[PDB]
């Protein structure tokens, strides 16, 4: 049921993510840069995420206020690593949607579908 929300900043490694899985956290939300930044050089983040993504759901939203995230167009990268996009969801809707889904399922492939589907108007899909 438990969820960790981390804001991406420069000089931030995978090590803390590894430790959340290792602490029994069930999901991670990342406030990426802009429309979905994911550092892929000078950083183990892209590696580390690519590992943990196929264990727990790793959700990508933005640290900005307006305009969701568009990994399709750094983003494609993360998507191909296992990152689940929050699209245009609020931070609150993103956290609570994930949690709601968790207590129902543990399977990352299913979560990715539900997290992508518009349930109650939270999301433009």
């Amino acid at each position: 049921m438990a969820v960790l929300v981390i804001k991406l900043i420069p000089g931030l490694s995978g090590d803390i993510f590894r430790a959340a899985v290792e602490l029994g956290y069930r999901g991670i939300v990342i406030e990426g840069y802009g429309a979905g930044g994911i550092p892929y050089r000078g950083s183990d983040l892209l590696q580390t995420i690519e590992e943990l993504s196929k264990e727990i759901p790793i959700v990508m939203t933005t640290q900005a206020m307006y305009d969701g995230v568009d990994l399709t167009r750094v983003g494609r990268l993360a998507l191909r690593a296992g990152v689940i996009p929050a699209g245009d969801m609020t931070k609150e809707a993103t956290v609570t949607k994930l949690m709601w889904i968790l207590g129902h399922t543990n399977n990352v492939e299913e979560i990715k579908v539900l997290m992508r589907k518009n349930l109650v108007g939270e999301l433009r899909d």
Binding site: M65, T90, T96, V120, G121, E122
Partner: protein
């Protein structure tokens, strides 16, 4: 015709812990002509203490009352108001009535309180028959899953993010957007 008001406490109810019951909150806020209302103090706690289990009880309760009332209002501390409203939106997929969260930046016992406006806003929308989960604040009504607390020291504390404002109480009119 008939609305239920459910207290969870918050800054609106303090004399953040809810000293004041929800019925008392409505009174001091200045909504007198409401006996075709009922009241239920579910919590009476500082909202920064809100936990996922609190969400479960509220939704349980909300489920007990959707077929019993025409509209439902939940008063809340502002700090986590939008987490609750978002989570209830998922737990109550497709409510048959409006369900409207609100609260205030200034306690209702102060004479500058935004509680009168937010409460009149929630009332006007809960009697509107426009179904779903919403947040009422500073004259505006926002979708519960699209609402975020955006300012920490202003009356205009909440905003619809990536979505348009649902309605707006202008004078005594509900202008749907």
């Amino acid at each position: 015709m008939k609305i239920l008001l459910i207290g969870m406490g918050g800054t609106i109810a303090s004399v953040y812990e809810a000293s004041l019951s929800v019925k008392e909150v409505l009174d001091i806020a200045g909504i007198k002509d409401c006996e075709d209302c009922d009241f239920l103090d579910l919590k009476n706690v500082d909202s920064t203490l809100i936990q996922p289990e609190d969400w479960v009880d509220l939704a349980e309760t909300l489920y007990k009352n959707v077929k019993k009332y025409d509209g439902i209002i939940v008063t809340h501390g502002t700090d986590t108001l939008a987490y609750t409203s978002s989570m209830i939106s998922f737990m109550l997929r497709n409510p048959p009535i409006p369900i409207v969260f609100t609260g205030s930046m200034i306690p209702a016992t102060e004479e500058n309180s935004d509680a009168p406006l937010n409460l009149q806003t929630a009332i006007k929308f809960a009697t509107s028959g426009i179904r779903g989960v919403y947040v009422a604040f500073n004259g505006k009504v926002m979708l519960g899953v699209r609402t975020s607390k955006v300012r920490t020291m202003s009356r205009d504390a909440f905003e619809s993010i990536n979505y348009p404002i649902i309605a707006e109480l202008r004078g005594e009119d509900l202008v749907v957007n």
